[PDB]
Design a protein around this ligand. Structure first.
Ligand SMILES: CCCCCCCCCCCCCCCCCC(=O)OC[C@H](COP(=O)([O-])OCC(O)COP(=O)([O-])OC[C@@H](COC(=O)CCCCCCCCCCCCCCCCC)OC(=O)CCCCCCCCCCCCCCCCC)OC(=O)CCCCCCCCCCCCCCCCC
Ligand SMILES: CCCCCCCCCCCCCCCCCC(=O)OC[C@H](COP(=O)([O-])OCC(O)COP(=O)([O-])OC[C@@H](COC(=O)CCCCCCCCCCCCCCCCC)OC(=O)CCCCCCCCCCCCCCCCC)OC(=O)CCCCCCCCCCCCCCCCC
Ligand SMILES: CCCCCCCCCCCCCCCCCC(=O)OC[C@H](COP(=O)([O-])OCC(O)COP(=O)([O-])OC[C@@H](COC(=O)CCCCCCCCCCCCCCCCC)OC(=O)CCCCCCCCCCCCCCCCC)OC(=O)CCCCCCCCCCCCCCCCC
Ligand SMILES: CCCCCCCCCCCCCCCCCC(=O)OC[C@H](COP(=O)([O-])OCC(O)COP(=O)([O-])OC[C@@H](COC(=O)CCCCCCCCCCCCCCCCC)OC(=O)CCCCCCCCCCCCCCCCC)OC(=O)CCCCCCCCCCCCCCCCC
Ligand SMILES: C/C=C/C(=O)SCCNC(=O)CCNC(=O)[C@@H](O)C(C)(C)COP(=O)(O)OP(=O)(O)OC[C@H]1O[C@@H](n2cnc3c(N)ncnc32)[C@H](O)[C@@H]1OP(=O)(O)O
Ligand SMILES: CCCCCCCCCCCCCCCCCC(=O)O[C@@H](COC(=O)CCCCCCCCCCCCCCC)COP(=O)(O)OCC[N+](C)(C)C
Ligand SMILES: CCCCCCCCCCCCCCCCCCCC(=O)O[C@H](COC(=O)CCCCCCCCCCCCCC)COP(=O)(O)OCCN
Ligand SMILES: CCCCCCCCCCCCCCCCCCCC(=O)O[C@H](COC(=O)CCCCCCCCCCCCCC)COP(=O)(O)OCCN
Ligand SMILES: CCCCCCCCCCCC(=O)SCCNC(=O)CCNC(=O)[C@H](O)C(C)(C)COP(=O)(O)O
Lengths: 228, 85, 253, 312, 84, 83, 193, 157
């Protein structure tokens, strides 16, 4: 891809100009006698591009400040990445649908050498502390807390993965079924009263993401009062 | 002296900067101002070496002719020349 | 209760202690010492900005600490081998003692990869080992060389995984033997792949970056208003030590 | 009062920021520095423009989420955190009158990169460690005195559940919550231990003096009685408590009190103190040479690297 | 096993022989200092000091307090890595 | 497959220990005697550079054949109590 | 580092400037070359390896002195001094292999050129026996320079970072002296005369 | 394969009693396949007890002078005295031990711990002053509290 070749040349030239400028600014600081540049503050980035691969975030999506997205990440409409969650697409890309939630300190990524891209559908609940490596998740699926979904596994639409389960590599989970266990296996079908709570789950997270985004805006304005 | 000594000095400066990065654990393109300073120093160092080439040839022919070794005029141009070979 | 002031710290007592609720920006260091226990690391290490490496930790060669991972060497020593990868938000801790009577330090050999959300505490991991995701290896346990632990596995305290095999489950049982090509090449392949990803991150990092400009702008505004306090920290540490010695002497007699 | 308390130059006393320039030479250097800073920031911005869309992402300091507010809800009662008045900028911009911040005791330790939000109460001598998530947003989170939530552990509550019950999370006294443990809408009584990597689900009760083992999954609405150890996925009965493990629980709580003290001491130092300490470390390593020419005249203080007295 | 179990035994008997309060024929290769030979603590300390003089060692107070028999003394000398 | 070490472990380790139960001398005596030998008697070789090459080559081979190696050197005289 | 560079330059310049003798130094050439090569082959400590290899190099410089032709002496001494400046200031151990290939006289690097003009001028005035001994000791020297390469090139890389400032403080000089792979273009010409 | 025992660390544990040069007995635990010098280092013994293995390509291995009883003489690994490893052991005996040598003198890296060493009692032997380079030497007196285990690297240079 020669387009990527031109982008590579431009990114490397701009990076060299940035290094030269920051170094000259540090020389200026040393001449002034001010050593604020030496502070070992937290250099965490909520959005982390990988050369010319920038995450594509919708204007109604939200990523928490302790969360992060890296590389080729697509977040759809009203989709949320919560506190401490890590979504990594610097090796292979990540695609997240609309109204889907990646809950607190969850890992979604495609970083193994033979992993395909991660594809998460619409209205998907990814629970606390779940690890997702190179999988495909269909629409209206709850990923339970502290669960592992392996490479090339297919979580079809309407299925429930229980908490603490481990779905093996290349495992197809059918529609409308509940699977549990560390050698994860079919337990039962999804019941109707269960499916009502499954339908009502992602909208709550949408409104919770709205409230938390507003509070983070308040925090940013409080921070901006100090230096501006 | 040699015609392409400055270009050789610039390649030497680039390799110098790359090695100074590799020793300190950085990628090859990091700190390009170090590469630029190394290129300037390498260019002027190898141009000075190429000047010493002509100077050494001139000293040899001058000393040899003062001692009594008479060199024919077809061969004196091999020495008393700022040849840009 | 334990006081939060230390007069026998190597660099002296803390003159000014800041409450955490009074902080207006995040000041979490990624590499920092705990009294006299300083981390040791090479020139080509990758430490992620939201990872924490504290205390008595030795890092070698081409090892990497990925995003949100914790290596806390406060009760004992932790060693990370050459080209060993600690992936995203895995925890490595160490106890003061183990039931087996051996050294309680967590020792991780070269070419060892530790998958996301795994926990290692006072265990011995020999070279070329894959620890799976959501796995716990407890106090005093031993994982032998060229072995693989399946994801979501528990290794109970003072237990052993034999060399050359794949183990998994809670508690961990025998699954299968690794092939000879798996022991020869695949473990090194996984470690090399994660080192390459860490190198990709290391190439693009601008350290220290430019986030300090705002904090310096706030400090410049304070110097403009005349509210910036200049503290002689060396002299205050000296005077606090002298007062501590006088207070200690004026109670024994 | 070291030995030269009235003759040291201001640059040596204040290495983080030198005082105001006086003479012609210092002012010329300051002006050159401001020019260099301007040209350097300009070249940085131009390089970010030439670079492409990746240059639009800028380096910014992160908010302090160790002490963070949530929305005060009318249906949610505030029993763990405290309702504090909103900032006036937030009120005049995006319609906030009251927020909920945590109730944090003065002896508790919170990691600078932890996330403690909203309706959370932290008891005396308790600790929340690096990367822990305590999100009290739809209900309350209570942590007792001398309790520790270890690294990368997740604590969360429910308001809406499958069976329509709003459940807080209550953690008793002298409780150890293991590394990467998941605590979700449940009750942990006094002097209990939850193993590292374990999961306790909604509405489960761990009675006093019990242990949940490492990697265990506690199913919802399960009661683990006193003096029992449970393990597995799903967790069943394994053993009764040993005589020594009950004292081991208290030993673990006391050990994390002692550890949280040292970590709070290191964490709560200012930038100026840290920079002064780095200059002191540099001087100490320069003084470690026994052939240093000052060793024959001056004796140096060990902790600050100042001249204490004349040796001869 | 740092030294043999015969020559050390006869050397032990040789230094046990010159004690005025002991019987030169009652001494056996496996006896006791208290029930058999009839010695209090100070006599035991004196015998251990004689053994230390013959083998060129240093036996601390706790180790010499644990020694209560001829066989115990022989085993302690044999287990010692600095014996002569 | 790995080859077997020849011999017995006790006998081999006694062979490894032999003739080293002795305090090593300082090197000052060897160095001073070498410098005295060169500074006093190396002028005896001044006319040797003009001698025929067969003589010089045979003399070099003779010096190589009668040379005793300094490393791992031992004498039986180190452990006897009379000549 | 100080002892292997500066006094040898000072004393050889005095020898070039104001010294004549009516004698020979050939037996000391033989002693230095054979003793240095065999000693560096036999000594496992690295400090003794480099001491004996230095004795071998001073034997080569004495062969350059004995056959006259001080131009080859000065060229080899300069290349040796630059290698010494690289050797004693190394923190990355991979460049220890460049010192090894450039002290073994391997062709494209500058040590080859420094040895090879000494060999050329020795063959020009027909100093055959000393030259043959020098060639045998050059064949022996390669074995322990290969031992150096085995030790420090075919090994995993570990270089500790600085903690108390001064971060890898002599990378400039060591990286500048490693560019003895670019000096051979000027060395092949009639340069040092 | 059946209901047989899960592997424990206690199955591979080897216990050795070590008497240091002050006469104090120590309990040293190790694992099968680990050398004795490694178990001595990990126990926490001071750095003055250890010295480089003086062979080519093995100076990064630390070694100690131990006294081994006659019952365990045949469980030390065999070294050919004509090989290069034999000359390494001869150099170590020539330079480090000298006149502290006894008939029970061995070197701890040549002892590989197995079940046959379980209950074996060894003692640490004295050594003479030595130097490898400026950053690794021994002046002759065992007055230092620095453990060998706390050194991050073993440096041949
Ligand atoms: C097209 C150009 C490069 C080809 C390529 O990589 O194709 C990209 C493209 C795929 O791109 P990608 O998958 O995103 O990954 C691209 C790389 O992997 C991404 O790699 P990267 O961006 O991290 O590394 C830089 C990149 C290539 O990027 C560059 O370096 C571009 C060259 C100019 C920019 C560099 C200037 C700043 C660097 C400082 C270093 C020296 C200091 C200079 C200062 C003093 C000089 C005055 O390197 C390569 O991939 C190839 C390396 C060799 C190419 C040229 C370098 C030789 C020496 C350069 C001398 C510089 C001095 C000039 C002044 O491949 C193709 O299109 C297929 C090939 C067909 C074309
Ligand atoms: C309008 C355009 C704006 C101009 C842009 C200039 C480039 C940025 C330079 C940054 C700078 O001055 O400070 C960096 C840096 C200090 O910044 P820092 O990162 O905070 O300091 C790092 C440490 O803390 C260091 O701490 P420190 O502050 O104590 O460091 C002092 C530093 C000196 O820096 C300073 O004190 C200030 C620097 C000058 C400021 C004024 C210049 C404007 O020490 C040195 O002398 C560094 C030595 C490095 C090598 C220099 C040359 C060695 C020649 C020997 C021969 C070796 C090669 C031969 C080959 C072998 C053949 C056999 O200073 C240097 O490293 C100076 C190196 C040389 C600078 C001159 C560059 C001229 C060449 C053209 C550049 C081409 C790129 C153009 C960029 C735009 C398009 C991509
Ligand atoms: C008067 C006061 C008395 C003071 C006496 C001072 C003695 C102090 C002790 C001492 O010096 O320590 C030894 C000391 C040991 O040296 P180091 O510095 O410790 O170590 C250096 C090496 O590592 C040496 O290492 P190493 O000694 O441990 O042994 C390792 C061994 C290791 O050896 C090997 O592994 C290499 C062997 C290679 C081939 C092996 C043979 C395989 C063949 C296959 C089998 C087929 C059969 C073939 C038969 C043989 C054919 C070759 O190396 C050798 O044996 C070779 C070294 C011989 C040096 C020869 C250089 C001499 C001039 C060169 C021309 C002659 C060379 C022969 C070539 C010519 C042949 C045509 O030696 C010296 O320093 C040399 C000077 C001592 C000799 C003369 C003493 C001066 C006293 C003068 C007497 C009175 C004046 C009369 C003469 C006029 C003035 C000169
Ligand atoms: C009238 C005579 C005036 C004085 C002439 C003799 C004094 C030269 C001393 C010197 O250059 O001080 C270094 C000093 C840099 O030391 P530093 O930045 O404080 O130390 C930083 C560290 O050393 C770490 O930084 P670094 O190691 O990267 O840099 C060390 C330093 C020099 O580093 C070296 O020693 C390696 C450079 C190798 C090139 C050697 C050139 C010889 C070529 C022969 C050609 C014929 O860097 C340079 O290359 C600075 C050259 C500046 C112009 C020299 C004229 O350069 C200057 O500040 C400028 C001095 C120039 C005159 C004023
Ligand atoms: C950083 C702070 C640390 C702390 O202070 S505590 C937090 C972390 N601590 C922990 O690791 C808690 C868990 N540790 C323990 O293992 C313990 O508490 C666990 C106590 C119940 C038991 O650990 P033990 O070392 O006492 O092992 P047991 O003798 O009780 O094992 C009996 C049995 O249970 C099984 N067992 C034992 N432990 C576990 C586990 N963990 N999971 C599943 N199954 C297990 C095991 O299979 C055993 O059977 P077999 O191996 O088949 O013979
Ligand atoms: C255009 C090219 C300019 C060259 C760059 C500037 C010089 C290189 C500076 C390198 C960075 C090192 C540094 O910190 O600078 C020194 C380098 O110092 C110098 O090089 C200064 C030399 C004197 C310059 C001429 C002064 C005016 C003369 C004309 C009248 C200043 O030391 P400080 O202690 O920070 O200065 C004290 C002053 N103050 C309190 C304001 C912080
Ligand atoms: C870039 C290097 C890395 C940076 C670090 C720098 C290190 C410090 C400086 C270098 C140290 C090594 C120098 C060694 C001495 C060599 C020069 C001696 C002089 C010499 O060779 O003789 C002159 C030739 O000069 C010449 O032109 C000799 C050419 C150069 C010889 C060195 C070859 C290796 C390079 C002739 O003298 P004359 O005929 O004018 O004398 C007549 C009046 N008495
Ligand atoms: C040593 C390296 C070479 C390896 C093989 C040597 C084989 C022996 C040489 C046979 C040459 C043929 C020959 O005998 O002719 C000689 C020609 O003289 C000559 O010209 C003798 C030259 C032979 C040696 C040339 C090899 C030098 C290679 C480089 C050496 C290193 C630098 C120099 C030390 C003298 O004939 P005759 O006496 O038998 O006739 C009898 C009637 N008169
Ligand atoms: C240079 C010469 C200077 C010497 C000066 C030093 C002289 C110090 C002498 C004074 C110290 C004493 O008597 S100390 C007083 C010793 N008497 C007591 O303590 C009362 C209890 N009786 C015992 O202890 C007996 O020894 C016994 C019943 C045998 C216990 O049997 P064992 O033994 O089995 O235990």
């Amino acid at each position: 891809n020669p387009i990527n070749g031109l982008k590579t040349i431009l990114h490397r030239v701009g990076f060299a100009m940035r290094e030269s400028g920051q170094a000259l600014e540090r020389v200026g600081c040393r001449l002034q006698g001010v050593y604020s540049f030496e502070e070992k503050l937290n250099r965490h980035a909520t959005v982390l591009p990988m050369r010319h691969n920038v995450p594509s975030l919708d204007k109604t999506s939200w990523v928490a400040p302790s969360g992060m997205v890296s590389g080729s990440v697509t977040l759809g409409e009203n989709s949320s990445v919560w506190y401490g969650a890590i979504v990594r697409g610097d090796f292979q890309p990540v695609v997240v649908g609309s109204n889907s939630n990646i809950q607190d300190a969850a890992y979604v990524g495609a970083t193994s050498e033979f992993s395909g891209p991660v594809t998460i559908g619409d209205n998907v609940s990814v629970g606390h502390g779940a690890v997702l490596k190179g999988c495909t998740v269909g629409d209206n699926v709850l990923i339970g807390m502290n669960s592992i979904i392996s490479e090339h596994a297919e979580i079809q639409s309407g299925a429930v993965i229980a908490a603490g389960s481990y779905v093996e590599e290349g495992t197809t989970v059918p529609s409308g079924e509940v699977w549990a266990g560390s050698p994860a296996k079919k337990l039962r079908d999804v019941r109707a009263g269960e499916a009502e709570y499954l339908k009502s789950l992602p909208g709550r997270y949408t409104e919770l993401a709205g409230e938390h985004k507003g509070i983070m805006k308040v925090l940013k304005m409080k921070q901006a009062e100090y230096f501006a | 002296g040699w015609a392409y000594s400055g270009e050789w000095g610039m390649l030497a400066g680039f390799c110098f900067g790359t090695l100074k990065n590799v020793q300190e654990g950085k990628a090859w393109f990091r700190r390009p101002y170090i590469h630029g300073a190394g290129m300037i120093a390498g260019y002027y160092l190898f141009k000075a070496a190429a000047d010493w080439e002509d100077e050494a040839l001139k000293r040899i022919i001058t000393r040899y002719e003062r001692k009594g070794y008479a060199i024919p005029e077809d061969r004196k141009e091999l020495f008393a020349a700022n040849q840009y070979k | 209760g334990v006081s939060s002031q230390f007069f026998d710290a190597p660099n002296g007592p803390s003159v000014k202690q800041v409450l955490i609720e009074d902080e207006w920006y995040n000041r979490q260091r990624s590499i920092f010492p705990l009294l006299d226990k300083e981390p040791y690391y090479p020139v080509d290490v990758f430490v992620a900005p939201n990872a924490v490496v504290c205390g008595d930790v030795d890092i070698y060669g081409g090892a990497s600490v990925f995003f949100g991972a914790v290596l806390r060497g406060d009760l004992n020593k932790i060693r990370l081998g050459n080209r060993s990868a600690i992936l995203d938000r895995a925890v490595v801790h160490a106890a003061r003692a183990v039931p087996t009577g051996l050294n309680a330090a967590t020792l991780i050999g070269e070419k060892v990869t530790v998958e996301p959300y795994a926990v290692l505490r006072s265990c011995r991991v020999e070279p070329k080992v894959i620890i799976g995701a959501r796995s716990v290896v407890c106090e005093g346990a031993v994982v032998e060389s060229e072995s693989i632990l399946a994801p979501n596995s528990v290794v109970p305290p003072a237990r052993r995984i034999p060399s050359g095999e794949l183990w998994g489950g809670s508690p961990a049982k025998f699954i299968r033997k690794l092939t000879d090509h798996e022991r020869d090449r695949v473990l090194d392949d996984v470690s090399t792949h994660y080192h390459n990803l860490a190198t990709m991150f290391r190439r693009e990092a601008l350290e220290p970056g430019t986030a300090w400009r705002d904090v310096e702008a706030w400090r410049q505004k304070l110097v403009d208003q005349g509210e910036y306090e200049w503290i002689n920290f060396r002299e205050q540490k000296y005077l606090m030590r002298l007062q501590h010695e006088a207070e200690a002497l004026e109670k024994l007699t | 009062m070291s030995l030269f308390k009235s003759s040291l130059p201001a640059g040596f006393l204040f290495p983080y920021r030198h005082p105001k320039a006086k003479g012609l030479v210092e002012g010329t250097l300051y002006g050159l520095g401001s020019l260099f800073r301007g040209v350097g920031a300009a070249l940085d911005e131009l390089g970010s423009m030439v670079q492409g869309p990746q240059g639009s992402v800028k380096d910014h300091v992160q908010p302090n989420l160790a002490f963070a507010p949530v929305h005060r809800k009318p249906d949610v009662p505030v029993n763990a955190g405290q309702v504090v008045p909103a900032p006036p900028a937030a009120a005049r911009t995006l319609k906030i009158k009251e927020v909920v911040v945590p109730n944090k005791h003065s002896t508790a330790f919170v990691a600078a990169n932890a996330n403690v939000l909203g309706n959370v109460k932290l008891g005396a001598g308790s600790s929340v460690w690096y990367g822990a998530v305590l999100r009290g947003d739809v209900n309350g989170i209570e942590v007792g005195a001398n309790s520790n939530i270890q690294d990368n552990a997740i604590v969360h509550v429910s308001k809406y559940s499958m069976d329509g019950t709003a459940r807080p999370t209550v953690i008793g006294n002298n409780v150890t919550i293991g590394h990467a443990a998941t605590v979700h809408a449940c009750t942990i009584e006094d002097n209990c231990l939850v193993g590292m990597g374990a999961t306790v689900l909604d509405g489960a009760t761990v009675k006093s003096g019990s242990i949940v083992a490492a990697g265990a999954v506690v199913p919802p609405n399960t009661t683990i009685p006193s003096g029992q150890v449970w393990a597995g996925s799903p967790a069943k009965f394994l053993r009764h408590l040993e005589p020594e493990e009950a004292s081991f629980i208290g030993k673990s709580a006391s050990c994390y009190a002692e550890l949280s003290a040292i970590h709070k001491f290191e964490q709560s130092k200012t930038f100026e103190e840290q920079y002064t300490e780095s200059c002191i470390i540099k001087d100490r390593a320069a003084l470690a040479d026994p052939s240093n020419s000052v060793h024959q005249m001056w004796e140096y203080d060990s902790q600050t690297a100042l001249v204490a007295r004349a040796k001869r | 096993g740092f030294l043999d179990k015969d020559s050390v035994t006869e050397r032990v008997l040789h230094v046990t022989k010159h004690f005025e309060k002991i019987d030169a024929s009652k001494v056996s290769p496996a006896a006791s200092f208290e029930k058999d030979l009839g010695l209090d603590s100070l006599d035991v300390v004196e015998l251990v000091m004689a053994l230390e003089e013959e083998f060129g060692l240093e036996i601390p107070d706790a180790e010499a307090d644990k020694i209560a028999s001829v066989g115990d003394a022989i085993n302690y000398i044999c287990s010692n890595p600095m014996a002569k | 497959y790995k080859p077997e070490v020849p011999g017995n472990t006790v006998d081999n380790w006694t062979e490894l220990r032999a003739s080293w139960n002795k305090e090593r001398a300082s090197s000052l005596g060897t160095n001073y005697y070498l410098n005295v030998a060169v500074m006093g008697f190396a002028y005896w070789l001044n006319e040797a550079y003009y001698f025929p090459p067969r003589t010089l080559y045979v003399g070099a081979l003779v010096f190589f054949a009668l040379y005793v190696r300094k490393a791992y050197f031992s004498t039986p005289y180190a452990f006897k109590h009379e000549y | 580092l100080y002892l292997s560079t500066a006094p040898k330059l000072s004393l050889f310049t005095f020898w070039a400037s104001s010294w004549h003798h009516d004698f020979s130094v050939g037996v000391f050439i033989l002693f230095s070359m054979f003793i240095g090569s065999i000693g560096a082959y036999g000594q496992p400590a690295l400090r003794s390896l480099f001491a004996y290899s230095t004795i071998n190099e001073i034997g080569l410089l004495l062969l350059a002195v004995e056959t006259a032709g001080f131009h080859t002496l000065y060229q080899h001494l300069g290349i040796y001094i630059i290698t010494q400046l690289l050797l004693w200031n190394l923190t990355d151990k991979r460049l220890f292999a460049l010192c090894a290939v450039s002290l073994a006289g391997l062709p494209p690097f500058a040590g080859f050129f420094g040895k090879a003009w000494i060999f050329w001028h020795a063959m020009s005035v027909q100093a055959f026996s000393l030259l043959a001994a020098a060639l045998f000791c050059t064949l022996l020297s390669l074995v322990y320079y290969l031992r150096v390469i085995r030790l420090f090139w075919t090994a995993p890389v570990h270089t500790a970072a600085s903690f108390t400032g001064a971060p890898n403080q002599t990378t400039l000089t060591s990286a500048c002296a490693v560019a003895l792979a670019f000096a051979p273009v000027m060395l092949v010409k009639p340069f040092v005369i | 394969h059946g209901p047989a025992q899960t592997p424990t660390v206690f199955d591979k544990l080897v216990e050795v009693t070590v008497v240091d040069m002050n006469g104090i007995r120590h309990r040293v635990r190790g694992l099968q396949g680990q050398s004795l010098a490694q178990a001595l280092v990990e126990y926490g013994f001071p750095d003055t007890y250890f010295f480089p293995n003086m062979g080519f390509y093995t100076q990064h291995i630390v070694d100690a002078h131990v006294f081994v009883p006659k019952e365990f003489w045949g469980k030390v690994q065999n070294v050919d005295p004509e090989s290069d490893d034999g000359l390494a052991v001869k150099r170590m005996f020539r330079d480090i031990v000298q006149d502290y040598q006894r008939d029970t003198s061995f070197f701890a890296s040549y002892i590989t711990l197995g079940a046959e060493h379980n209950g074996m009692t060894v003692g640490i032997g004295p050594i003479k002053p030595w130097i490898l380079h400026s950053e690794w030497a021994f002046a002759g007196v065992h007055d230092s509290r620095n453990k060998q285990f706390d050194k991050p690297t073993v440096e041949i240079w």
